[PDB]
Design an enzyme around this catalytic site. Structure first.
Site, PDB file in Angstrom:
ATOM      1  CG  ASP A  13      -2.041   1.033   1.143  1.00 24.87           C
ATOM      2  OD1 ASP A  13      -1.819   2.121   1.461  1.00 24.87           O
ATOM      3  OD2 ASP A  13      -3.132   0.742   0.728  1.00 24.87           O
ATOM      4  CG  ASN A  69     -12.310  -0.116   2.754  1.00 24.08           C
ATOM      5  OD1 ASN A  69     -12.634  -0.724   3.790  1.00 24.08           O
ATOM      6  ND2 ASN A  69     -11.209   0.639   2.655  1.00 24.08           N
ATOM      7  CB  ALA A  75     -13.271   4.628   3.952  1.00 27.29           C
ATOM      8  CD  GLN A  76     -14.413   0.570  -3.590  1.00 23.68           C
ATOM      9  OE1 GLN A  76     -15.648   0.483  -3.403  1.00 23.68           O
ATOM     10  NE2 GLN A  76     -13.749  -0.105  -4.549  1.00 23.68           N
ATOM     11  CB  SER A  77      -9.797   5.894  -2.029  1.00 24.36           C
ATOM     12  OG  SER A  77      -9.400   7.091  -2.679  1.00 24.36           O
ATOM     13  CB  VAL A  78      -9.029   3.483  -6.288  1.00 19.54           C
ATOM     14  CG1 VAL A  78      -8.970   2.988  -7.713  1.00 19.54           C
ATOM     15  CG2 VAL A  78      -8.028   4.585  -6.008  1.00 19.54           C
ATOM     16  CG  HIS A  82      -8.364  -1.980  -3.209  1.00 21.50           C
ATOM     17  ND1 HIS A  82      -9.203  -1.210  -3.979  1.00 21.50           N
ATOM     18  CD2 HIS A  82      -8.169  -1.283  -2.046  1.00 21.50           C
ATOM     19  CE1 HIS A  82      -9.557  -0.112  -3.278  1.00 21.50           C
ATOM     20  NE2 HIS A  82      -8.984  -0.152  -2.058  1.00 21.50           N
ATOM     21  CB  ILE A  83      -8.171  -8.042  -0.452  1.00 19.54           C
ATOM     22  CG1 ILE A  83      -9.260  -8.647  -1.311  1.00 19.54           C
ATOM     23  CG2 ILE A  83      -8.284  -8.503   1.002  1.00 19.54           C
ATOM     24  CD1 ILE A  83      -9.284 -10.180  -1.268  1.00 19.54           C
ATOM     25  CG  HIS A  84      -6.958  -2.396   2.362  1.00 22.47           C
ATOM     26  ND1 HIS A  84      -6.066  -1.346   2.248  1.00 22.47           N
ATOM     27  CD2 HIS A  84      -8.135  -2.008   1.818  1.00 22.47           C
ATOM     28  CE1 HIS A  84      -6.692  -0.384   1.574  1.00 22.47           C
ATOM     29  NE2 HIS A  84      -7.965  -0.757   1.318  1.00 22.47           N
TER      30      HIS A  84
END
Lengths: 96, 96
Positions: A13, A69, A75-78, A82-84
Protein backbone atom coordinates in the site's frame (compact mmCIF):
# COMPACT_ATOMS: atom_id res chain seq x y z
CA UNK A 1 5.56 -6.60 -6.21
CA UNK A 2 5.04 -9.35 -3.67
CA UNK A 3 3.14 -11.79 -5.91
CA UNK A 4 1.67 -11.86 -9.43
CA UNK A 5 -0.18 -14.43 -11.56
CA UNK A 6 -2.57 -14.34 -14.54
CA UNK A 7 -5.50 -13.43 -12.19
CA UNK A 8 -4.02 -10.93 -9.65
CA UNK A 9 -1.28 -8.58 -8.48
CA UNK A 10 -0.06 -7.97 -4.91
CA UNK A 11 1.84 -4.83 -3.92
CA UNK A 12 2.56 -2.69 -0.85
CA UNK A 13 0.00 0.00 0.00
CA UNK A 14 1.23 3.45 -0.79
CA UNK A 15 -0.24 4.94 2.39
CA UNK A 16 0.49 2.16 4.88
CA UNK A 17 -1.59 1.94 8.03
CA UNK A 18 0.41 -0.86 9.71
CA UNK A 19 4.04 -2.07 9.64
CA UNK A 20 2.89 -4.55 6.98
CA UNK A 21 0.14 -3.29 4.67
CA UNK A 22 -0.34 -4.72 1.18
CA UNK A 23 -3.06 -4.93 -1.43
CA UNK A 24 -4.36 -7.96 -3.38
CA UNK A 25 -6.11 -6.88 -6.56
CA UNK A 26 -7.68 -8.81 -9.38
CA UNK A 27 -6.66 -8.05 -12.97
CA UNK A 28 -10.35 -8.52 -14.07
CA UNK A 29 -12.45 -5.31 -14.06
CA UNK A 30 -14.45 -5.67 -10.84
CA UNK A 31 -15.03 -2.15 -9.44
CA UNK A 32 -16.19 -3.07 -5.90
CA UNK A 33 -17.33 -6.17 -4.01
CA UNK A 34 -21.01 -5.10 -4.31
CA UNK A 35 -20.70 -5.53 -8.10
CA UNK A 36 -19.06 -9.00 -8.06
CA UNK A 37 -21.16 -11.72 -9.71
CA UNK A 38 -21.54 -15.50 -9.54
CA UNK A 39 -18.96 -15.90 -12.38
CA UNK A 40 -16.37 -14.29 -10.01
CA UNK A 41 -16.74 -17.00 -7.29
CA UNK A 42 -13.51 -18.87 -8.20
CA UNK A 43 -11.52 -15.61 -8.54
CA UNK A 44 -12.77 -14.24 -5.21
CA UNK A 45 -11.66 -17.42 -3.41
CA UNK A 46 -8.31 -17.20 -5.22
CA UNK A 47 -7.79 -13.62 -4.00
CA UNK A 48 -8.38 -14.69 -0.36
CA UNK A 49 -5.95 -17.66 -0.75
CA UNK A 50 -3.32 -15.30 -2.24
CA UNK A 51 -3.86 -12.88 0.63
CA UNK A 52 -3.29 -15.59 3.27
CA UNK A 53 -0.22 -17.05 1.48
CA UNK A 54 1.32 -13.57 1.12
CA UNK A 55 0.58 -12.88 4.83
CA UNK A 56 2.68 -15.94 5.70
CA UNK A 57 5.53 -14.74 3.42
CA UNK A 58 5.42 -11.28 5.10
CA UNK A 59 5.74 -12.82 8.61
CA UNK A 60 2.17 -12.21 9.80
CA UNK A 61 1.95 -15.41 11.82
CA UNK A 62 0.93 -13.57 15.04
CA UNK A 63 -2.17 -12.32 13.19
CA UNK A 64 -3.51 -9.86 10.65
CA UNK A 65 -6.68 -8.32 9.30
CA UNK A 66 -8.19 -8.53 5.80
CA UNK A 67 -10.36 -5.58 4.78
CA UNK A 68 -12.52 -4.90 1.71
CA UNK A 69 -14.07 -1.44 1.44
CA UNK A 70 -17.24 -0.80 -0.59
CA UNK A 71 -18.47 2.65 -1.51
CA UNK A 72 -18.42 5.94 0.34
CA UNK A 73 -19.42 4.59 3.81
CA UNK A 74 -16.76 1.87 3.51
CA UNK A 75 -14.15 4.54 2.70
CA UNK A 76 -13.35 3.02 -0.73
CA UNK A 77 -11.16 5.56 -2.55
CA UNK A 78 -10.46 3.90 -5.91
CA UNK A 79 -13.29 1.92 -7.60
CA UNK A 80 -11.31 -1.20 -8.46
CA UNK A 81 -11.64 -4.20 -6.14
CA UNK A 82 -8.76 -4.48 -3.67
CA UNK A 83 -8.22 -6.51 -0.48
CA UNK A 84 -6.12 -4.78 2.19
CA UNK A 85 -3.94 -7.02 4.45
CA UNK A 86 -2.67 -5.30 7.59
CA UNK A 87 -0.35 -6.78 10.23
CA UNK A 88 2.76 -6.33 12.32
CA UNK A 89 0.95 -4.36 15.04
CA UNK A 90 -2.11 -4.93 17.24
CA UNK A 91 -5.23 -4.13 15.19
CA UNK A 92 -7.94 -2.50 17.29
CA UNK A 93 -11.71 -2.96 17.50
CA UNK A 94 -13.90 -1.62 16.04
CA UNK A 95 -12.25 -1.89 12.61
CA UNK A 96 -12.91 1.75 11.88
CA UNK B 1 -30.84 -15.54 10.86
CA UNK B 2 -30.42 -13.44 7.74
CA UNK B 3 -29.41 -16.24 5.34
CA UNK B 4 -28.58 -19.96 5.51
CA UNK B 5 -27.62 -22.65 2.99
CA UNK B 6 -25.79 -26.00 3.08
CA UNK B 7 -22.39 -24.15 3.16
CA UNK B 8 -22.94 -21.14 5.51
CA UNK B 9 -24.95 -19.24 8.10
CA UNK B 10 -25.43 -15.47 8.41
CA UNK B 11 -26.52 -13.81 11.66
CA UNK B 12 -26.31 -10.46 13.46
CA UNK B 13 -23.19 -9.82 15.54
CA UNK B 14 -23.87 -10.01 19.22
CA UNK B 15 -21.64 -7.02 20.00
CA UNK B 16 -22.45 -4.74 17.07
CA UNK B 17 -19.96 -2.08 16.08
CA UNK B 18 -22.14 -0.35 13.45
CA UNK B 19 -25.89 0.14 12.88
CA UNK B 20 -25.68 -2.94 10.62
CA UNK B 21 -23.17 -5.57 11.72
CA UNK B 22 -23.55 -9.22 10.72
CA UNK B 23 -21.38 -12.30 10.41
CA UNK B 24 -21.01 -14.77 7.51
CA UNK B 25 -19.64 -18.09 8.70
CA UNK B 26 -18.95 -21.34 6.94
CA UNK B 27 -20.39 -24.57 8.34
CA UNK B 28 -17.09 -26.39 7.41
CA UNK B 29 -14.45 -26.44 10.20
CA UNK B 30 -12.05 -23.71 9.09
CA UNK B 31 -10.60 -22.08 12.24
CA UNK B 32 -9.06 -18.94 10.67
CA UNK B 33 -8.22 -17.62 7.19
CA UNK B 34 -4.51 -18.49 7.67
CA UNK B 35 -5.52 -22.18 7.82
CA UNK B 36 -7.75 -22.20 4.69
CA UNK B 37 -6.50 -24.48 1.91
CA UNK B 38 -6.81 -24.79 -1.87
CA UNK B 39 -9.85 -27.11 -1.45
CA UNK B 40 -11.66 -24.16 0.23
CA UNK B 41 -11.36 -21.84 -2.84
CA UNK B 42 -15.00 -22.32 -4.02
CA UNK B 43 -16.36 -21.94 -0.45
CA UNK B 44 -14.35 -18.78 0.23
CA UNK B 45 -15.72 -17.15 -2.94
CA UNK B 46 -19.22 -18.27 -1.92
CA UNK B 47 -18.85 -16.61 1.49
CA UNK B 48 -17.88 -13.27 -0.15
CA UNK B 49 -20.85 -13.51 -2.59
CA UNK B 50 -23.21 -14.22 0.35
CA UNK B 51 -21.75 -11.28 2.23
CA UNK B 52 -22.38 -8.87 -0.68
CA UNK B 53 -25.92 -10.20 -1.35
CA UNK B 54 -26.81 -9.90 2.35
CA UNK B 55 -25.36 -6.34 2.41
CA UNK B 56 -27.82 -5.42 -0.36
CA UNK B 57 -30.73 -6.98 1.60
CA UNK B 58 -29.70 -5.00 4.72
CA UNK B 59 -29.72 -1.67 2.80
CA UNK B 60 -25.95 -1.11 2.64
CA UNK B 61 -26.00 0.49 -0.80
CA UNK B 62 -24.13 3.63 0.40
CA UNK B 63 -21.21 1.37 1.36
CA UNK B 64 -19.87 -1.11 3.89
CA UNK B 65 -16.73 -2.85 5.05
CA UNK B 66 -15.89 -6.58 5.06
CA UNK B 67 -13.41 -7.67 7.72
CA UNK B 68 -11.70 -11.00 8.45
CA UNK B 69 -9.60 -11.20 11.61
CA UNK B 70 -6.74 -13.71 11.99
CA UNK B 71 -5.06 -14.47 15.28
CA UNK B 72 -4.18 -12.32 18.25
CA UNK B 73 -2.90 -9.25 16.29
CA UNK B 74 -6.03 -9.33 14.11
CA UNK B 75 -8.19 -9.36 17.26
CA UNK B 76 -9.82 -12.72 16.38
CA UNK B 77 -11.76 -13.82 19.47
CA UNK B 78 -13.31 -17.15 18.42
CA UNK B 79 -11.22 -19.53 16.25
CA UNK B 80 -13.86 -20.33 13.65
CA UNK B 81 -13.72 -18.44 10.35
CA UNK B 82 -16.15 -15.51 10.21
CA UNK B 83 -16.52 -12.51 7.89
CA UNK B 84 -17.80 -9.32 9.56
CA UNK B 85 -19.95 -6.95 7.43
CA UNK B 86 -20.34 -3.47 8.89
CA UNK B 87 -22.42 -0.60 7.47
CA UNK B 88 -25.00 2.06 8.14
CA UNK B 89 -22.43 4.59 9.40
CA UNK B 90 -19.22 6.11 8.03
CA UNK B 91 -16.38 3.60 8.58
CA UNK B 92 -13.10 5.32 9.44
CA UNK B 93 -9.51 4.78 8.34
CA UNK B 94 -7.38 3.08 9.49
CA UNK B 95 -9.59 0.01 9.96
CA UNK B 96 -8.40 -0.45 13.50
Amino acid sequence: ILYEDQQCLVFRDVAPQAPVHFLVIPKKPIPRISQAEEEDQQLLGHLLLVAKQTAKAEGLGDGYRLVINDGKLGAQSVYHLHIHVLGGRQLQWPPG
